[PDB]
Amino acid sequence: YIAPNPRISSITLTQRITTTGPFAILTGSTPTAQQLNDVRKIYLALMFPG
Amino acid sequence: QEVLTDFRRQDTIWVLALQLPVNPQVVWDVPRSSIANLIMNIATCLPTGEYIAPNPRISSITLTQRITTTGPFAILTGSTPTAQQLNDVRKIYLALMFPGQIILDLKIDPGERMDPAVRMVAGVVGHLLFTAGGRFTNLTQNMARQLDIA
Amino acid sequence: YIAPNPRISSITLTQRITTTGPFAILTGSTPTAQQLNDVRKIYLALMFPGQIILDLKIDPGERMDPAVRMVAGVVGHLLFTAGGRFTNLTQNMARQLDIALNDYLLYMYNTRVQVNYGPTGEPLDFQIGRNQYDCNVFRADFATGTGYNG
Amino acid sequence: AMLLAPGDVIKRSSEELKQRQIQINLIDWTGRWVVLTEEIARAIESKYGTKIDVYRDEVPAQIIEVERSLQKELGISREGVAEQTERLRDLRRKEKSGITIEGVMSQKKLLSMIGGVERKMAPIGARESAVMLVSNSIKDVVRATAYFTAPTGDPHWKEVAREASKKKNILAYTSTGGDVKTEFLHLIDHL
Amino acid sequence: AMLLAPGDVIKRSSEELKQRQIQINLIDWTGRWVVLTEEIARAIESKYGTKIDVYRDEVPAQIIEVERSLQKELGISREGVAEQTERLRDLRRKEKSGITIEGVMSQKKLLSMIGGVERKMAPIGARESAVMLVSNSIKDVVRATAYFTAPTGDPHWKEVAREASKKKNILAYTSTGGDVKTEFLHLIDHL
Amino acid sequence: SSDSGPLLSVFALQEIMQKVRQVQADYMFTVPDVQKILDDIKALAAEQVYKIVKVPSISFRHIVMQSRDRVLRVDTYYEEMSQVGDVITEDEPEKFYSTIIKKVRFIRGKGSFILHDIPTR
Amino acid sequence: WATIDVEYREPAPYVHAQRYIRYCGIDSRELINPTTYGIGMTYHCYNEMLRMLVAAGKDSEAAYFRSMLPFHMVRFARINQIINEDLHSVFSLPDDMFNALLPDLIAGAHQNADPVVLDVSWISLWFAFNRSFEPTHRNEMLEVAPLIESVYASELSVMKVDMRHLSLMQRRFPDVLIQARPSHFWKAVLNDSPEAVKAVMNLSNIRDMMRWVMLPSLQPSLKLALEEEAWAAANDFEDLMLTD
Amino acid sequence: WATIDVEYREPAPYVHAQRYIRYCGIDSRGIGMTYHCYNEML
């Protein structure tokens, strides 16, 4: 799994959070390990449609 | 005259390898080349020049505000901006010289502590530097809202 | 060769430069030695009407104060003749002189007057002044020689 | 909007957190001046939000003497000036019948001496920040909606981090470079 | 509009050239007073375009004490006067706990002492002069559009004159009588 | 303080490229010098497709044998163009078509010439 | 505000760009002098803004903005001259796409090329308002642009006709010629194209490539005239000495 | 929305399953391609 922009962990948080709003709050947060499993489940459902 | 009337001589043959009245459709028919066309337009025919401050016969603007202990009494006009501000003013002028192809947008740095006065007067100058309707726009709607609020 | 006023070299420059404008800049300047040769060439063409013809020397890597071009464009119409019976200058020189005269006429250096432009893009196709004067008669036409001494 | 952070971060930023009105819940692990009369102190507290004590003949102390310039600046009534100078005369008599008084008369001197910075000129919102509580307790780990991490450590921070990462839907932020306090303040501003 | 002139002329008229904002390119051939606070210096610099230094407890120096008359003339706020007199009191205490101060209180005294002359009341154009550069270098002989000559001489002026006269279309001006500097200034005004 | 066409162009490339690099895929930079591009394009415009020669290139050459009455005539065109392009292989069509393009380019290159000032007596 | 920013006067040297831009209604047909231009002339927006500012009681700011007016007028005069006089080229955006920029932004249904957005700060607005652009002298390559444009168009046309002839040749002899996809011989053609054109065009799929190939717009040139004859002469494989 | 994602082209090695799946209508035989739902979203 790859983020749209690589090595975003190196850049400072201030450059990731730029404005206000729900999307601004969502952007810049790093996912927890457990949520990666749910991302895997979502992709698994993506490969098998029905 | 060597370019305009030299071809009428009887001792010269002009082999026209390249024809001048080129139809612009050929250049613009190549897919997804707006950026390249704009860059080449800037590169090939933009004149060179300098940035000059206004006449020093105009003093610094003084704000009619009650005095706070750390606020700026006036904002100087002869002060030299930093390199980043020079890049930003270059962006402003470049977008001004190309009406509909380049558009501005605000950006706020986490640091760079600025008094409210500079923003509060930039909101004044924005309504005069740019046009926001009629035939084209130089600024996005977010910039329009921010300038109106300021 | 004699200047209209003798011994102008003795008088101080301040008495020669009195006002502002292209003519004021032109007045008071002393010619260089090399330009005297070109003056000799112009007079030589004046003595021989149909056997000597003039043309403009343009260097691709040279420049000048536009006031001298404006003044030359104004002067050339009165100084030379073209059309009717004979000519002293090529068609290209006539076109350049017409363009220079147009640029001088649209130079609002001291006062502003109303101007109405013509449908066509040719130079001198406009009416100027409170009294509508047609400037199209000053465009060169070798068939009748309206724009010059003929 | 409840946040979990290392204890040293909140310890270092307690002043800013108090200034921005977020309540602090933290677990540890191991001369002033007075005004002549209560009216001037009340006026200055209303103007700047700074608590000021009142002189009550206690001990040899340091007295602040608000001057005509600040009297006009603060919009003080005539009676306030009259009672101030009456108390001043009383002090003159007291020290003549045998305490230091300072006649501060510039706004900047008063600010740099004691008190809080003046107010900025923006519209006043209903609340300064959208967050209510930042804590460092395992007793309210279920209370939190997001948490913040830093390379700095606490003896209880590892267990709290483990118990907070187990939440199904929680926002996680980490700081790697720059200043920890500045990043935390920017986050608390934008959250 | 670029001009070539003898080096001594530009050397003698550098002050006027700087005052009229034409940049100088030349090749050679071989106690001040301070203001109590930065606000008054900034105000006077804005009003007259004169740079003023700030007193910073350096050495026994000479201090300018702007007086009530100039305080009202310059439109100085109450806080500026208050901080000025606070610094004055500090100086009184410093020199009593054992520097010269001048209480200038007329406009003409300040002008004749230090600073630039006041501004005239004409409409302000976009630019003071139509010329940008006056130089004395052979490296930019092709840069020039006109040149000025004088009976005065430079070790490099003859070669520059020869290389400039070769231009096909160049304006030439020469001064024979009167004052060279006055003629040069009149030319630079009317050009 | 100063500005120029190429400098502002380089600045525009830097800004646009920095904006567009924010999103990329496949998890696999340089800013071209506009001076070099302009110089190359100007030189290419200054190039001449044809060429002026006094004598046409040799078309037929002869190899003398031991016989005094017989000789071989060789067409120079075919003996030399065989060196144009690399060998052909059927697995990669791209190289084959590149060789075809080079071969068709060579004919156009050879066939463009102008005779001028031929030496005669 | 109530100004005619765009107008069409006469046919231009390039038929695709007829519009004339004029900020604040200033005409670019008349030359100006920086010393005296802009004194005592205003446009609607500036006058209304000054009236509003003086009505609010801010006298100092109104006086400052009144004093700066000639500098403002001269700056937009220079900008208008630069836009109308120098930047006229084929690389300028055509009128049809220019007219649709604003409505597309209003509707948000972006289908053409999106405009470039740039970031700017608060202090930059003040610095821009307190600075002007003065052209010292014209570009070195301003005089020689049309030849470059013509050679670029000619090279594009040559590549297009080469693609067409390759497709026709591949269709002509399917028995011996190796079957290939367009991405193969297009890359083969691009391998032989001059480097300058590739560098110019690479400053920024297959469906768009086919759409571009199918377009009927061609640019006549001597190189094309020789190339078509060479392709016609290439119909004989023996002339290429490729035999089966 | 307004797009077709399942289609049949030619017989498959497995006779029981011959369908093709094309999310968003894109096929392998990524700049500029869009679909109706995303345009309506914008």
PDB file of C-alpha atoms in Angstrom, chain G residues 108 111 205, chain H residues 30-31 39:
ATOM      1  CA  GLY G 108     -17.030  24.044 -12.435  1.00  0.00           C
ATOM      2  CA  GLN G 111     -13.261  19.874 -19.595  1.00  0.00           C
ATOM      3  CA  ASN G 205      -2.053   8.019 -24.194  1.00  0.00           C
TER       4      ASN G 205
ATOM      5  CA  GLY H  30      -4.118   7.614 -16.882  1.00  0.00           C
ATOM      6  CA  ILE H  31      -4.288  11.337 -17.612  1.00  0.00           C
ATOM      7  CA  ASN H  39     -17.960  14.974 -12.909  1.00  0.00           C
TER       8      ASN H  39
END
